[PDB]
Design a protein around this ligand. Structure first.
Ligand SMILES: C[C@H](CCC(=O)NCCC[N+](C)(C)C[C@H](O)CS(=O)(=O)O)[C@H]1CC[C@H]2[C@@H]3[C@H](O)C[C@@H]4C[C@H](O)CC[C@]4(C)[C@H]3C[C@H](O)[C@]12C
Ligand SMILES: C[C@H](CCC(=O)NCCC[N+](C)(C)C[C@H](O)CS(=O)(=O)O)[C@H]1CC[C@H]2[C@@H]3[C@H](O)C[C@@H]4C[C@H](O)CC[C@]4(C)[C@H]3C[C@H](O)[C@]12C
Ligand SMILES: Nc1ncnc2c1ncn2[C@@H]1O[C@H](COP(=O)(O)OP(=O)(O)O)[C@@H](O)[C@H]1O
Ligand SMILES: [Mg+2]
Ligand SMILES: [Zn+2]
Ligand SMILES: [Zn+2]
Ligand SMILES: [Zn+2]
Ligand SMILES: [Zn+2]
Ligand SMILES: [Zn+2]
Lengths: 795, 142, 73, 198, 100
């Protein structure tokens, strides 16, 4: 809590990590300004990596001397020693036991802020000596992972299989993955990625992938590798075209100094720079607006949403913005409990695996990734393969992995900040399978009204009012709050993306078997999480962090969001003192929470249920993929028993690795006027028909901008505008009940403009010919009744 | 009335069938063409890779499995450095030969961002502003 | 409405520029897009006119491209 | 699958699968070939066989196009018209089919057996497409004739050049001749390998 | 009634063409002649801006004196403008100050 952090400073100074004047530079703690701060933290390495070894010596000193006790953190002075024996019992020698459940489980997030296992990269495990040189080939470090574990975390009683392939279920996969995401900084970075092998078809040599070396899940081998094939079916052709091994082996090497991420190959002989043009101007309309008494010098409505432009090398910088993603090792008991609660949230929906002739592609003429986009849109591949092969493909990627390439394009749309936003269009060979796998659950989430995850619930026809009245599910002293995650798309640690994919794959308890589920998850990881981006004619490597062009994007984001909320809640309930909580129920609740968290190993369904009900009665939410609104009881939140913006700041500080400054967390304290801003639509309370309803209303500057600046030249004439304006007016109607006068006028502007447009249209038409028969219905768009119908609850 | 309705049905039925046949033919044509395109690209890509050194290192590998990145990193014959500034220039690929990834390369052409050529003399600390950075400099294994 | 007529003119100006293949001279396109993005977010007025002068001069620097007389008529 | 009629060259989607080579035939031309011979199966971009389960009738002359598929006279839906009418079998480009009446020699080719001299004298004295089609057909007949023969088991292997090879039981032995190049085989048990050509 | 229905059908059929041909003609016209529309609109707006500096540089650019690089802003930077004649010269030049 940067307002009062007066021991972090004292430690960092006491141990010569950074001299004093550092902290007189404003804005230092931030991880996205002066990322140099990591160099300051990483100078606690060889003071933490010493404490670990002193613990492992002490544990043995206990075991072989016949004592039993617990090892709490707060008995170890930073030097390393141990000095507390108040409650140790003694038994017959050679048989003691140390209990280290709750010691290595609070240090896990620190073991990768302060990068404490990097003195294992040097030779002889000494610091001063020079680096080690692993052979370039060695593609399998199982033995080394085993030795590191057995030398640092010795008495951690559970098991740990390096290659996650042989893990028992969704409570062991998370465990072993979160261990690997720490053990995988000591190994060179040019030994992950696909694994290739020279196979033979029709007596000609190839090189095609057969495996993978994930940085978390370990080594994974295909199960159907066919040496000496003779024919090439269409499924086979697809699988071998989407693969990146052929391309990265037939290209030529490349070293890029524009970024700091990796760089694999460069397909062409030239790099291609990409630009973004400005957008055209709708003069006629702007001159109208200025004539109606607008845009004056010193008003309250002004343009702020323009079409920004970009020079050549924007794309590579915007890809380089990945430098924020760090390998973070989340705690591993609080996570294995929070995942339980977060699953309870997703109870009611259903789903499973489906056939091929049931998937419903919404829109079909959109690009199909690389390199398939050189021969057709998606319609071609979706009409070429028959349901038979289109299902054999699925039931074949249930038993192997398929790397892919995903492109990266600059977007062309209105905005208010001069940064350019990119979007990743994944290759079809992945969307087909992901669609078939998730479609049932997703179409079951988007068609259920009255639950937490609110996707697919319109704001029209009295939808916003129903959302807002569901959220107040009878909490006691409401105070609606909010928050927002900075750089949510480029900092989400890999562990939380994996937890999201697991919780969304927790429905096929009966459609699919266990190895099937694991190969599906490995496939999704290697296709979306850590893929081979192709940014401007040259491959690269994504370090991590989600991508925004796959199938399961908004829902995965919603899951991660609920996970951060529940984690902050758990932290805020534990951290409270405990002896001052006056009530006799919540204190017992805490006292059972801690024990069920650390002093236990198997699920506790009854207690999980009690906690989740407690939440749903004091922390009602509403979530649309990262845009939250909470309605937390307030007397509690002040006594310390639910979340608070300070707690969200903390949780993002040690799990996302960014800093959420409190200048963007609006907190409304009056229940009537609704949430300050949700999904970019402020909310007002307007009388309508003898009862009061909520209405959503946009930000006027955005509507004016969307009318005045159009992206294509043909959209500047009032040929189609007679229709492109009905929609803008429909979105801008609620401004007609605002009290501010310019908010009252940005409606009648559009409404007079439509009429003038239609009159000049009939003029030109009755000139080009001399007749017109039944274009009368348009007399119903320029009256304020048709729209006033659009925010009523009948239909 | 009977026969008139029968013929009226027959028209729509035949036309549906005919447009359906057209759709089928169209799909088959596109399918065959795309398969030919895919096969052609695959074979022309394959017939390029430097088969000798690749055979060498793979047959050296103890299983036939080698992580992908080292495949170009040790069998590519080219190197497309990209430089954003005179400083990193000075510190990566100065002069006419340089060393990277444990092997010896030599420059052969230094094309700037406008796809022009730039003689190795022009790149000088006082001749920085006139050159539209970055500086895509190729090379060759040696 | 004097302030907010120094942004629309810049939009039109940069569009006209791009329509003459100034995208090639990768230094010129850099400076032009810089001046445009900079004009758009300018609370003052005199500064807007400064950047406008510079951008327009970029347009004028070429002689045979845009016939100046037949327009200024 | 759209091609050119071997006689009318107009774009068409008709093939006689009753013919071993399946050439493209215009509407009227396939009509003439199907009314006259034992060629009693026609295949379009989709086969013309009664879709009714258990209805294994084949010839199109007993078929009526119904809803979205074609049925025998038995299982036909009410509105269903015959596929053969006005000298046209139902296929693509029925209004642009020009056709011809050269059905005669084409039929001669479709029906001959290649076991008499006159067959060959015709086959080398006909139209160009007719010539090439006769070539492909006779070659396929001789190919299946070769394949109609069988095996030969080695009684003894005297030397690299002298051989004691007994021939298949109950089979007309292929004579001692140069042209027929023999592929050999030695089964292990377990993956009989091809030992080459001799 | 049947005949009236038939005629009404013909009406609603004609209106489709009557209102589509217009979209087609107008749209192809707008898309074709654009490189001149942009410039004409530009100079209209630039006259209507009513600034002084712009007006001076524009008149000068009319009668010959065009600059060869982006006019700078800071109080120390280079500028290279041609001069085509003595008349325009003594029109602009004075002593050591060259006003522009
Ligand atoms: C869950 C854990 C492991 C179970 C086990 O069977 N261990 C090995 C068996 C040892 N023997 C004696 C049998 C059980 C076994 C013994 C239990 C401790 C002792 O009460 C002493 C002490 C009392 C204090 O007031 C509070 C804490 C203490 C340290 C307890 C902690 C915890 O609750 C222990 C470790
Ligand atoms: C008694 C105690 C808890 C009851 C259990 C829990 C974990 C077990 C140890 C470690 O897991 C692995 C280690 C590997 C060596 O090769 C053999 C001995 C080691 C020390 C084990 C000894 C013993 O079995 C331990 C301490
Ligand atoms: N109220 C108390 N007064 C004195 N000693 C106590 C009290 N409560 C606990 N202790 C003893 O002190 C130990 C904890 O002391 P603590 O404050 O942690 O100092 P240390 O960290 O040196 O142990 C307990 O194990 C117990 O033996
Ligand atoms: Mg103590
Ligand atoms: Zn495991
Ligand atoms: Zn399933
Ligand atoms: Zn014909
Ligand atoms: Zn036939
Ligand atoms: Zn039948």
């Amino acid at each position: 809590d940067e307002g009062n952090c007066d021991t972090l400073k004292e430690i960092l100074v006491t141990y010569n990590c950074c001299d004093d004047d550092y902290f007189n530079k404003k804005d230092w703690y931030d991880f996205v300004e002066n990322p140099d701060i990591l160099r300051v933290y990483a100078n606690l390495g060889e003071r933490v990596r010493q404490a670990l070894l002193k613990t492992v010596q002490f544990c043995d000193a206990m075991r072989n001397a016949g004592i039993v006790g617990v090892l709490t953190l707060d008995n170890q002075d930073l030097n390393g020693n141990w000095y507390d024996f108040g409650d140790f019992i003694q038994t017959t020698p050679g048989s003691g036991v140390p209990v280290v459940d709750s010691y290595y489980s609070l240090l896990m997030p620190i073991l990768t802020l302060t990068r404490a296992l990097t003195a294992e990269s040097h030779v002889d495990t000494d610091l001063t000596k020079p680096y080690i040189k692993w052979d370039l080939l060695k593609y399998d470090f199982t033995e080394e992972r085993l030795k590191l574990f057995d030398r640092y975390f010795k008495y951690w009683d559970q098991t740990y299989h390096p290659n996650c392939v042989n893990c028992l279920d969704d409570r062991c996969i998370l465990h072993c993955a979160n261990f690997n995401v720490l053990f995988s900084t000591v190994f060179p970075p040019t030994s992950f990625g696909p694994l290739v092998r020279k196979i033979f078809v029709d007596g000609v040599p190839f090189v095609v992938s057969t495996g993978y070396h994930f940085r978390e899940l370990g080594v994974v081998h295909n199960q159907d590798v066919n040496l000496h094939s003779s024919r090439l079916s269409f499924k086979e052709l697809l699988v071998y075209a989407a693969d990146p091994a052929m391309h990265a082996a037939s290209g030529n090497l490349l070293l890029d100094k524009r970024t700091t991420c990796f760089s694999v190959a460069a397909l062409t002989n030239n790099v291609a720079f990409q630009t973004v043009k400005p957008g055209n101007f709708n003069k006629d309309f702007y001159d109208f607006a200025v004539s109606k008494g607008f845009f004056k010098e010193g008003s309250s409505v002004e343009l702020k949403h323009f079409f920004f432009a970009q020079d050549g090398n924007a794309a590579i910088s915007d890809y380089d913005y990945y430098r924020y993603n760090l390998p973070t090792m989340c705690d591993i008991r609080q996570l294995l409990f929070v995942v339980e609660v977060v699953d309870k949230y997703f109870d009611c929906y259903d789903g499973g695996c489906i056939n091929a002739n049931q998937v419903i592609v919404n829109n079909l003429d959109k690009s199909a990734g690389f390199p398939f986009n050189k021969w057709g849109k998606a319609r071609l591949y979706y009409d070429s393969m028959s349901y038979e092969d289109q299902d054999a493909l699925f039931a074949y990627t249930k038993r192997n992995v398929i790397p892919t390439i995903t492109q990266m394009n600059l977007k062309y749309a209105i905005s208010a900040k001069n940064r350019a936003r990119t979007v990743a269009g994944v290759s079809i060979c992945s969307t087909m399978t992901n669609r078939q796998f998730h479609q049932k659950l997703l179409k079951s989430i988007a068609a259920t009204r009255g639950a937490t995850v609110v996707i697919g619930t319109s704001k029209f026809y009295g939808g916003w009012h129903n959302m807002l009245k569901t959220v107040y599910s009878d909490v006691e002293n409401p105070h609606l709050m909010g928050w927002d995650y900075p750089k949510c798309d480029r900092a989400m640690p890999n562990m939380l993306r994996i937890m999201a994919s697991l919780v969304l794959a927790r429905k096929h308890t009966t459609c699919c078997s266990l190895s099937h589920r694991f190969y599906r998850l490995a496939n999704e990881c290697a296709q979306v999480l850590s893929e081979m981006v192709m940014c401007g004619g040259s491959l690269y490597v994504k370090p991590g962090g989600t991508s925004s062009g796959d199938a399961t994007t908004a829902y995965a984001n919603s899951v991660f969001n609920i996970c951060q909320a529940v984690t902050a809640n758990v932290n805020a309930l534990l951290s409270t003192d405990g002896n001052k909580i006056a009530d006799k129920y919540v204190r017992n609740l805490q006292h059972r929470l801690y024990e069920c968290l650390y002093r236990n190993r198997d699920v506790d369904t009854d207690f999980v249920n009690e906690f989740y009900a407690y939440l749903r009665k004091h922390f009602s939410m509403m979530i649309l993929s990262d845009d939250a609104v909470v309605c937390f009881n307030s007397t509690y939140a002040s006594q310390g028993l639910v979340a608070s913006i300070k707690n969200f700041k903390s949780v993002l500080y040690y799990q996302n690795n960014v800093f959420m400054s409190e200048a963007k967390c609006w907190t409304e304290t009056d229940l009537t006027k609704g949430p300050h801003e949700f999904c970019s639509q402020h909310t007002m309370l307007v009388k309508q028909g003898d009862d009061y309803v909520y209405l959503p209303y946009p930000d006027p500057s955005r509507i004016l901008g969307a009318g005045c600046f159009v992206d294509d030249i043909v959209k500047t004439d009032g040929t189609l505008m007679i229709e492109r304006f009905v929609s803008l007016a429909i979105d801008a109607y609620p401004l007609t009940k605002h009290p501010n006068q310019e908010y009252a006028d940005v409606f009648h502007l559009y409404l007079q403009y439509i009429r003038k447009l239609h009159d000049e249209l009939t003029g030109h038409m009755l000139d080009m010919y001399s007749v017109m028969l039944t274009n009368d219905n348009t007399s119903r768009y320029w009256e304020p009744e048709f729209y006033e119908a659009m925010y009523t609850p009948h239909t | 009335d009977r026969d008139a309705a029968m013929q009226r049905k027959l028209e729509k039925m035949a036309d549906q069938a005919m447009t359906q046949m057209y759709k089928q033919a169209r799909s088959e044509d596109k399918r065959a063409k795309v398969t030919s395109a895919m096969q052609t690209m695959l074979f022309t890509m394959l017939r390029k890779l430097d088969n000798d050194a690749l055979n060498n290192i793979i047959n050296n590998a103890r299983d036939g499995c080698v992580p992908l990145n080292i495949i170009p990193l040790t069998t590519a014959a080219k190197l497309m450095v990209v430089i954003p500034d005179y400083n990193t220039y000075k510190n990566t690929c100065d002069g006419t030969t340089f060393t990277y990834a444990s092997a010896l390369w030599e420059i052969q052409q230094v094309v700037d961002a406008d796809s022009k050529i730039v003689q190795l003399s022009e790149i000088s600390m006082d001749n920085s502003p006139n050159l539209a950075w970055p500086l895509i400099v190729t090379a060759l294994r040696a | 409405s004097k302030m907010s007529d120094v942004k629309c003119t810049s939009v039109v100006l940069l569009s006209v520029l791009q329509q003459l293949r100034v995208e090639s001279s990768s230094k010129l396109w850099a400076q032009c897009v810089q001046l445009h993005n900079d004009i758009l977010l300018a609370k003052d007025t005199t500064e807007a006119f400064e950047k406008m002068v510079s951008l327009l001069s970029v347009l004028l620097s070429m002689q045979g491209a845009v016939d100046i007389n037949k327009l200024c008529e | 699958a759209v091609g050119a009629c071997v006689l009318c060259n107009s774009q068409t989607s008709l093939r006689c699968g009753a013919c071993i080579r399946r050439p493209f035939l215009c509407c009227k031309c396939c009509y003439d070939h199907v009314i006259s011979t034992s060629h009693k199966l026609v295949l379009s971009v989709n086969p013309y066989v009664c879709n009714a389960p258990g209805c294994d009738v084949t010839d199109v002359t007993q078929l009526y196009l119904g809803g979205m598929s074609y049925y025998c006279k038995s299982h036909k839906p009410p509105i269903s018209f015959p596929l053969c009418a006005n000298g046209q079998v139902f296929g693509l480009y029925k209004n642009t089919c020009v056709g011809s009446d050269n059905v005669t020699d084409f039929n001669a080719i479709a029906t001959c057996d290649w076991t008499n001299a006159g067959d060959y004298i015709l086959a080398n004295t006909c139209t160009e497409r007719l010539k090439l089609f006769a070539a492909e057909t006779l070659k396929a007949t001789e190919e299946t004739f070769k394949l109609s023969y069988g095996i030969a088991t080695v009684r003894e292997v005297l030397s690299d050049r002298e051989l004691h090879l007994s021939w298949e039981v109950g089979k007309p032995r292929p004579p001692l001749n140069r042209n027929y190049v023999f592929t050999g085989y030695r089964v292990t048990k377990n993956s009989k390998v091809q030992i080459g050509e001799y």
